[PDB]
Design a protein around this ligand. Structure first.
Ligand SMILES: Cc1cc2nc3c(=O)[nH]c(=O)nc-3n(C[C@H](O)[C@H](O)[C@H](O)COP(=O)(O)OP(=O)(O)OC[C@H]3O[C@@H](n4cnc5c(N)ncnc54)[C@H](O)[C@@H]3O)c2cc1C
Ligand SMILES: CCCCCC/C=C\CCCCCCCC(=O)O[C@H](COC(=O)CCCCCCC/C=C/CCCCCCCC)COP(=O)(O)OC[C@H](O)CO
Ligand SMILES: CCCCCC/C=C\CCCCCCCC(=O)O[C@H](COC(=O)CCCCCCC/C=C\CCCCCCCC)COP(=O)(O)OC[C@H](O)CO
Ligand SMILES: CCCCCC/C=C\CCCCCCCC(=O)O[C@H](COC(=O)CCCCCCC/C=C\CCCCCCCC)COP(=O)(O)OC[C@H](O)CO
Lengths: 410, 412, 406
């Protein structure tokens, strides 16, 4: 087959869904290819009001989290209310990606200009003329999209689409295909997830972090009146942890957090946990060719602290959407103009990563630094200039300068 | 009235009394002059240090001293918002016997005097204010004392005590400093301690060395003789006057907010007349022996801030070295300035390394708006450092015994 | 006029540039040095590098003072001490080695080889190539000096290297990009007569109440002192007047009363800007490359400056010779220099950023910086960081021909 949809978007993640909808509202016939966190930041609310999409997003079900609290040995040592960072709307929210992804498509399917092909593993299809034409995708039945007529193409397809963007995600095959380079690749700690019944004593819209004797815990609201917890461990510590047996692991967890005694009286194995790798990649040059460019997690994946991940990629997509809409508005979509995305996001993307690196330094479990890290954190948050850090970690100082046409008027 | 004597010790404090006793066992006829009648005149505190236990063992006096009433304090505990952040047992500092004790000064002063009146070689004239009496030969012969009725150990009007070497142990508030034309190299005063005692609750123990970092104030808790607990509230110089202006009601409210177990005691507190304000003064004299036949030691020379219970035993330690200088000074008839200036040459190392250590500790008592919240966190971090035990040993114990003539040991 | 060709041009005769030419004269390529006309202390990385090139004895013959250890003070009380011999099993120490002595010593062993050439007092403009490459440079000369080889000249010499330094004009000519540009603090330098109380081979840093001080040995029995100030604070200091500034300095460091009993103005001080740069792509064209301070200038803490650029120049000299073993000295091969130094350069800089955070003078952070430094130096893993700051784990793998046989 041969599809000529002017632009192809590899990956149907939250960054891509925003790239297509902001380009389908422009007119460019885009084709999205998909092979198949829950907490948002005040940066997310700023972006949605910027495009006047907040009410549309806020219409769905979501739980607003008003503040972060950090404890040490079951005593509070830090408290920040997000409403106190910027004068505009500012808060964290429990908004699952399926909820946000479908709401973004519900307003995107109404525009036949876009097209998304679900359950389609995609290989590469470059161009011989010193550029990239598109990709080659081995499909699989099941999709609606906007170019099917109930027929589409349930097999091999060639989509020659001029400029090809890579938003596959953290586990991206597009990193290698484009012959890119990872300037920074970070991974030191894991998060061991598990849910439990929220006790009558606790609240629900919670962003709680605990520095306890044996492990450090992260608590978030889980959709359904439950609380999802994440224990922070060193890279490789989980394997050693399973060897010592569930009885010792439970005895240590209940020693730190005695309120989880009821929940772990039923836990008898390690099959209830979920290990997640807190990696953090960075690509040296996001646009190294003509018609080829990397954005999103494929370029600037980050650690989960601060809820920066989901909303940081989206912000880069919006700037790319302004370069792409302005790139066809001046007929300059070459390498020199496509690389302007990274030249505009370098400031915010790097400052966030370094700050994430500094935050990660508190998760150390080496024998002497471990005992003083909570005490250090309490001192750190008590500095005069801590509020600048909170503003830099959670909010944007100025809105993204884009074409006024990107605002959704009603 | 004229009286002669081998050595005159102005002031009968724990350093002055220990100096005389170590000299009556030597033979030198000493005369001690104290302006107060009985030993229990000034409070002067009641808590001793492991250094005190080691120095008494050097003189084979530990059993004689421990014979009296005393309460042994086995460990120090530091809390932050009523949560323990530090704990140290003095028995783990040195392999020998090591502990703090609640031993009142009148008890120790009378116990030392009971072994000194038995030697007719000594003499203490209680209730005798002492003015100055220099020597015409570019030196000091003794002192001139305006006496008063009191006790006697071996006159009732003007008296001149010309006794060659005259020691000044007058104390922190010493008149000897100005008479001898001395010089203060270091003069420190930053904080006050507001003392008050209360009935020990059933919840607490008694032999306690507890320091609390609370929201409003910091509290020190120690055993008070009689089963009570004496508390000291830490204030900055001049803050008390401001507190009294705000009234006992606001102050009691703030104390109870930090220490709710004191509601019982404060249901009876209705004014500030129940507290005792104490000035944490620390001083250091540049040259302790600047003339011939005259000397300062003890608190008159190097008084220190209370933390660690170093004060009594640090002054007594300098008195013990002074007793070694005078005993070997009469054994060679060399009691000149070059020989009397040897005391400071032997005490400078330990006295300066403790005074500077005190300065660091006092820095945790800061009450400025942001540093106040970080001083407990800083304290918790330091006490979790690998080499912290070296500091505890330096603060509470002596590494080696004071090298003195073997004749100073009290029999066996 | 005078379209001189030659084989290679190195713009800038800095410590990095000079060593690059001498490592090429032992190879054979006729090099041309261009100079238009700074840190007297080197680190143990320097001793490791000179042993690799068998040059240690050659420098140690010259005048130099070996500094064996750092001491960090807080209110005149020592809170850290580290001896460099305890870092690597080989020879390891700091030294006071003035740049004129090291720069001339490299030239005394380079002038003996007629293969090299350095044109002193020559401002250099650009001279690209019309065929999508770089031929050389255009230099407006002046009365200067001569090397073993007087008006406008164009030197088209295939590969042209930029070692101009921190104040580099060739950064702009090559259309380069600064990935990182840092500048937060200044150092106010002044020297004084070493008191009888002090030593000489000193690497002393003091956390005091008013200012933070650095003490280093000054060539000639004096001590050179550097006061740390925030960007723009010097201007504010001078308005307050020299009397106040001297009073505050003597408050921090009363031993300087004698030296400052004669100071009556600010003309005796020398302000230095602690800048730090990093170029995203060190070789972005064909035949054009930036190394040294022109590419990765760094802050003075640890004496990393001189020895770090030379390390990059040495790898660059090996890339050119091993690139000529296949005669592939194109952009794909010239990008090999940055691909081999990225790991070590980006680690020294990040450490320097963290070190620099201890120089903060903001109202609350200022009192706790000495306290934070003291804790960090007491960590179990501190010796590891000292190794990464002061020494290189393994010598640079280069052609065996680079060793100077006696
Ligand atoms: C309120 C308070 C509490 C303390 N608590 C403690 C504690 O818990 N632990 C601890 O280790 N230390 C404590 N100290 C320190 C301790 O009191 C001294 O460190 C110790 O007593 C050494 O004193 P000294 O003999 O050098 O002088 P002092 O004990 O001050 O000398 C007092 C004697 O000097 C006499 N005298 C004074 N002036 C004259 C004069 N002009 N002529 C003649 N005689 C004179 C007095 O009459 C009296 O006999 C405390 C001090 C105070 C003020
Ligand atoms: C709190 C009042 C006392 C109450 C109980 C009294 C009895 C016993 C407690 C004694 C504990 C004393 C702990 C002191 C630890 C400390 O500072 O030592 C340090 C331990 O190691 C460190 O450097 C740890 C980091 C610094 C810790 C704090 C230093 C002192 C500062 C206090 C000010 C805190 C308030 C906040 C100010 C800043 C706010 C921005 C130095 O010891 P060293 O090995 O270098 O040798 C000793 C040195 O020579 C001493 O000068
Ligand atoms: C002061 C200038 C230096 C003068 C002498 C120069 C010579 C030698 C000194 C060399 C050693 C300097 C000490 C550096 C200690 C240090 O940072 O160690 C680090 C560990 O500590 C850190 O990461 C420190 C982070 C930055 C500290 C900034 C200084 C804070 C001080 C004052 C401002 C107060 C605001 C913050 C207070 C609360 C802190 C939590 C390296 O180990 P790591 O675990 O991070 O692993 C390595 C990783 O790759 C990161 O590097
Ligand atoms: C802990 C998990 C997250 C819990 C809450 C989740 C969400 C959000 C909260 C994020 C808060 C992050 C606070 C980090 C503050 C921080 O380090 O900032 C830094 C402060 O400077 C530093 O780099 C301080 C040290 C960073 C931490 C180093 C490691 C400390 C922890 C454990 C090891 C202890 C031994 C080593 C100590 C080394 C000396 C510092 C920003 O730099 P700055 O000085 O220019 O900024 C000052 C700032 O304005 C006020 O501090």
């Amino acid at each position: 087959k041969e599809v000529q949809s002017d632009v192809c978007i590899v990956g149907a993640g939250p960054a891509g869904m925003l790239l297509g909808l902001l380009l389908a509202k422009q007119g460019l016939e885009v084709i999205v290819l998909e092979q198949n966190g829950e907490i948002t930041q005040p940066r997310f609310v700023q972006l949605m009001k910027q495009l006047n999409l907040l009410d549309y997003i806020e219409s769905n079900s979501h739980v607003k989290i008003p503040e972060v609290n950090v404890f040490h040995n079951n005593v509070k040592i830090m408290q920040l209310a997000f409403n106190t960072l910027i004068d505009e709307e500012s808060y964290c929210a429990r908004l699952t990606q399926p909820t946000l992804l479908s709401a973004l498509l519900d307003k995107a399917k109404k525009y036949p200009n876009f097209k998304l092909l679900f359950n389609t593993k995609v290989r590469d299809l470059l161009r011989e003329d010193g550029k990239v034409t598109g990709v080659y995708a081995v499909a699989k039945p099941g999709e609606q999209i906007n170019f099917t007529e109930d027929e589409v193409f349930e097999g091999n397809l060639n989509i020659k689409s001029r400029v090809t963007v890579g938003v596959d995600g953290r586990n991206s095959t597009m990193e290698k295909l484009g012959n890119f380079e990872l300037e920074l690749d970070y991974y030191d700690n894991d998060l061991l997830w598990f849910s439990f019944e929220k006790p009558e004593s606790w609240d629900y819209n919670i962003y709680h972090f605990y520095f306890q004797k044996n492990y450090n815990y992260l608590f978030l609201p889980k959709l359904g009146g439950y609380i999802q917890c994440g224990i922070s461990l060193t890279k490789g510590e989980y394997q050693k942890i399973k060897k010592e047996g569930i009885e010792s692991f439970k005895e240590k967890i209940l020693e730190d957090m005695p309120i989880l005694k009821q929940h772990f009286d039923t836990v008898t194995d390690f099959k209830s946990f979920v290990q997640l790798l807190c990696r953090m990649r960075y690509i040296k040059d996001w646009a190294k060719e003509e018609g080829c460019m990397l954005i999103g997690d494929a370029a600037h994946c980050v650690t989960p602290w601060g809820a920066v991940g989901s909303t940081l990629a989206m912000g880069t997509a919006v700037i790319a959407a302004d370069v792409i809409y302005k790139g066809f508005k001046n007929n300059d979509l070459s390498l020199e103009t496509l690389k302007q995305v990274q030249s505009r996001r370098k400031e915010e993307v790097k400052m966030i990563q370094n700050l994430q690196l500094t935050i990660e330094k508190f998760l150390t479990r080496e024998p002497i630094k471990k005992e003083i890290a909570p005490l250090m954190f309490s001192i750190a948050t008590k500095m005069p200039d801590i509020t600048n850090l909170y503003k830099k970690l959670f909010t944007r100082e100025f809105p993204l300068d884009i074409d006024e046409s990107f605002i959704f008027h009603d």
